[PDB]
Design a protein around this nucleic acid. Structure first.
Ligand code: MG
Ligand code: MG
Ligand code: MG
Ligand code: MG
Ligand code: MG
Ligand code: MG
Ligand code: MG
Ligand code: MG
Ligand code: MG
Ligand code: MG
Ligand code: MG
Ligand code: MG
Ligand code: MG
Ligand code: MG
Ligand code: MG
Ligand code: MG
Ligand code: MG
Ligand code: MG
Ligand code: MG
Ligand code: ZN
Lengths: 97, 25, 63, 91, 226, 127, 50
RNA sequence: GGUGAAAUUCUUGGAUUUAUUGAAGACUAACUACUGCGAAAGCAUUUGCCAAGGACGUUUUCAUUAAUCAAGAACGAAAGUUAGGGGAUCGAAGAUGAUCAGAUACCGUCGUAGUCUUAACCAUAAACUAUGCCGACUAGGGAUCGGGUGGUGUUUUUUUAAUGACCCACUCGGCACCUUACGAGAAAUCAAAGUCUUUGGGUUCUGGGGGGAGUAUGGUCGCAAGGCUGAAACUUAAAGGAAUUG
């Protein structure tokens, strides 16, 4: 039967959405169906921050961040514990944790 | 068996039958 | 032959598949105010003194 | 009435030379024997004299064109980019 | 990995840093600082004449370190070497650009990104391709959560951005353009012209790239480095 | 007071490259990879290999005369992963602790404006 | 289809070239009958890397 | 270099990597959303040109010109076909390196056709919302897109106008969404799948247990691949749908 009212994607009024590639396996997946996350992270991984702050030529340094928009297919998103299988009731939960 | 490959197999069969009938015709 | 003594101040938890490895956070005895995270094989408490054969390393997990 | 179904002008070739070659010469012979609009006198009087020579019966002008059409697409786009570069050389 | 080389050579010793010399690189006069580092080439032998090998070098340096302050920390300046006179070789402007972290922090969603670019020639015969970026912003008191533009506002904004860029670069030389780009007056002129179209935050001018330089004109280059 | 090179850490998977160049980037100093210090393709990309590479490039640039570095961290990019490998922060922290001076960390991973095509096919890398 | 007095390819109880039809550039007149100084031969698949 | 691990492969002729350029073709990232347009397939750089279209507004005009439609006609992803161009990537086939008992599969490295374009064809798809179109009525709730109306509302200009961007209230037309079940349904679920034994608003198409079988044959279209139309013999008591506990 029909599992999801949205068919597992976000396509109401298009007919076609150009696909992207999974960042883990290069599977072609429509852009609306993917499991888009946003990895915003400091570059120093929070353990060398003191060493770089004391080894910097400048005080007051910003220590910038790296930003990536990660696109996952369903299989890789499930296998990498990004999303997991939810109950039939809490499948409808739309809000992020 | 899967319906797509059943369709492919009977299409190859139809092609082979076409050629063995065109042998006489 | 340099080795670095480090006093464990906080035990985190067991690691590895079979639980025979413990994450610890050690504070260096000399050159204090320096903290690092290591893996320990045997039974460890806090306030123990480890002898790191090399200090320039930090572990994450053991799958 | 319609005498032939699909061979058209290539009915003069009969059964010879193959259908896939007769199709190409059909598509090209229609073009080289068609009449075209004269860009000077405005009439449908341009006819091919020889390969590349297209002359108007009314105004007696003679244009150099394609071998089977009065103007090829390559010549059209070359005229367009030449016009654009001429418009660009002042600006 | 250290021993897996099956053959080192298809067929079958001196340190090269004793062979090299240092060289101090100078920025043009449109900067409060000049000494932006040092560079290395081999010794100027009779067959190489190391000045020519060192001529075509492009060195990137941050505008914060060029201007002392830290508010220019997200802008980079490429300086192309053009002349060498005795160990304190002088450079010239080759292109501005932002950093990836700044651009990535600027671009967020539920707002509209507006880019424009012009390919315009300046007074002293340089051909510069200037890029400008802008972002829609929520007004104060706005309760709807995206604040997108309506794609004709975008076209008008891009038109006025392009004509302002051409007007500000024409009649200006290259050094005049750098002394315009440093204090960021183009951004305030753009927001002054576009405030009657959209609120329109983040009016940064992105990279500018040289496409065609005129001939060298060492007098005009030495007019900077005094 | 400080003399600067640039660091140019390309920390991919399967390897990590650390090599200091001049501010112009034309003169190369101390190219050491992760696989030049270990005996396995596995630990070519290990954080230990990265810090050893950072250690001996630090020694070489210190005996050359370079005191500080401008750091350019780089993933594979293009159509590929665009995320930094495991050896990036290791090499960075190692050449920070070695005694070099740091300034102006930035990322130079090549990101495409609508790249050609990722490898693997539309069904992906099936394993 | 000629006789061996007329062409290098002539003769034989079957119509066949015999030796390779690719001829050296340093060949002489009377020998250059075939593909002169062919860098490659056969059907041209893919782009020629022009 | 690659992988779970490797190997094939490239490397003192300098590989990998760094910098400066240059060429080629492809693509249009991030912005990008339970957002928009389009009859559908589909469509994401800028600018210019060409014609088109919906909604809204209207105290403009015609006057029933309309709805659905056998036949018939236009368009119709990808793949494929013909002939030129282009041919950077990726890559059916193929070749190799692994794995495996085997592995002409999955993984790795090359790599042809193709992938792009022009002129023609082909007429299919899980071409899906698996839900025909037109029309009326029937529960609440808020949000959003486009247009419009009003508000001494906020901000900007030239403090101040008009704009524009917001805010509030309303309205028309959309893509949808949330909650309930008066109702419906075999249930899953549905504001349509409701107003259907209290069975009739108009109309088109399709199905009659499962296989055999979308097969054979005969037509017709197509260069071909194939498409459309389309049985029977024989065989069988079950196949099948939605949910329940294991
Ligand atoms: Mg299921
Ligand atoms: Mg579709
Ligand atoms: Mg004879
Ligand atoms: Mg002879
Ligand atoms: Mg012979
Ligand atoms: Mg004979
Ligand atoms: Mg090299
Ligand atoms: Mg884009
Ligand atoms: Mg839109
Ligand atoms: Mg194969
Ligand atoms: Mg069908
Ligand atoms: Mg259907
Ligand atoms: Mg209705
Ligand atoms: Mg409205
Ligand atoms: Mg509405
Ligand atoms: Mg809509
Ligand atoms: Mg029945
Ligand atoms: Mg039946
Ligand atoms: Mg079931
Ligand atoms: Zn005429």
């Amino acid at each position: 039967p029909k599992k999801r009212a949205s068919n597992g994607r976000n396509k109401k009024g298009r007919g076609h959405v150009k696909p992207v590639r999974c960042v883990n396996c290069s599977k072609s997946i429509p852009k609306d169906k993917a499991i888009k996350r946003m990895a915003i992270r400091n570059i120093v991984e929070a353990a060398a921050v003191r060493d770089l702050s004391e080894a910097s030529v400048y005080p007051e340094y910003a220590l910038p961040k790296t930003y990536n928009k990660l696109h996952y297919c369903v299989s890789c998103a499930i296998h990498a514990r990004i999303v997991r299988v939810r109950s039939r009731e809490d499948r409808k939960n739309r809000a992020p944790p | 068996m899967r319906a797509k490959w059943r369709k492919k197999r009977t299409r190859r069969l139809k092609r082979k039958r076409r050629k063995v009938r065109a042998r006489s015709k | 032959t340099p080795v670095t003594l480090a006093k464990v101040i906080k035990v985190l938890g067991r690691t590895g598949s079979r639980g025979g490895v413990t994450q610890v956070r050690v504070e260096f005895l000399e050159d204090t105010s320096r903290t690092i995270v290591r893996n320990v094989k045997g039974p460890v408490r806090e306030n123990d003194i480890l002898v790191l054969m090399e200090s320039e390393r930090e572990a994450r997990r053991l799958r | 009435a319609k005498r032939t179904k699909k061979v058209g002008i290539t009915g003069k070739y009969g059964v010879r030379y193959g259908s896939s070659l007769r199709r190409q010469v059909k598509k090209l012979e229609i073009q080289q024997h068609a009449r075209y609009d004269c860009s000077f006198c405005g009439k449908k009087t341009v006819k091919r004299g020889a390969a590349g020579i297209w002359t108007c019966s009314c105004c007696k002008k003679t244009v150099a064109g394609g071998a089977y059409t009065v103007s090829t697409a390559a010549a059209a786009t070359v005229r367009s980019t030449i016009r654009r570069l001429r418009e660009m050389v002042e600006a | 990995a250290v021993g897996k080389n099956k053959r080192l050579s298809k067929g079958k010793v001196v340190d090269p840093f004793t062979r090299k010399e240092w060289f101090d690189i100078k920025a043009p006069s449109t900067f409060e600082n000049r000494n932006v580092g040092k560079t290395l080439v081999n010794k100027s032998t009779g067959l190489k004449s190391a000045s020519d090998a060192l001529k075509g070098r492009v060195v990137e340096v941050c505008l914060a370190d060029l201007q002392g302050s830290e508010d220019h920390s997200f802008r980079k300046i490429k300086l192309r070497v053009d002349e060498v006179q005795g160990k304190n070789l002088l450079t010239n402007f080759h292109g501005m650009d932002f950093t990836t972290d700044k651009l990535r922090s600027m671009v967020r969603k539920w707002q509209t990104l507006i880019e424009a670019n012009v390919t315009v020639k300046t007074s002293d015969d340089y051909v510069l391709r200037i890029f400008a970026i802008a972002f829609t912003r929520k007004q104060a008191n706005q309760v709807k959560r995206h604040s997108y533009a309506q794609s004709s506002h975008i076209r008008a904004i891009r038109k006025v951005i392009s004509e302002i860029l051409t007007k500000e670069v024409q009649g200006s030389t290259l050094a005049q353009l750098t002394s315009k780009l440093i204090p960021e007056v183009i951004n305030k002129e753009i927001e002054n012209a576009t405030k009657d179209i959209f609120p329109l935050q983040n009016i940064h001018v992105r990279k500018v790239k040289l496409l065609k330089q005129p001939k060298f004109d060492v007098g005009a280059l030495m007019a900077l480095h005094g | 007071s400080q003399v600067f090179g640039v660091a140019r850490i390309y920390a991919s998977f399967n390897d990590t490259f650390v090599h200091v160049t001049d501010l112009s980037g034309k003169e190369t100093i101390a190219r050491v990879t992760g696989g030049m210090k270990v005996k396995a393709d596995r630990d070519e990309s290990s954080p230990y290999a990265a810090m050893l590479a950072a250690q001996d490039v630090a020694a070489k640039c210190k005996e050359v005369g370079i005191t500080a570095v401008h750091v350019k961290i780089r993933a594979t990019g293009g159509t590929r992963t665009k995320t930094p490998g495991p050896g990036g922060q290791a090499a960075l922290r190692a050449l920070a602790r070695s005694g070099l001076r740091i300034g102006r960390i930035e990322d130079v991973t090549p990101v495409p404006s609508d790249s050609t095509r990722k490898k693997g096919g539309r069904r992906g890398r099936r394993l | 289809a000629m006789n061996p007095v007329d062409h290098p390819h002539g003769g034989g109880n079957h119509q066949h070239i015999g030796k390779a039809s690719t001829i050296s550039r340093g060949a002489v007149s009377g020998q250059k009958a075939g593909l002169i100084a062919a860098r490659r031969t056969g059907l041209l698949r893919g782009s020629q890397k022009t």
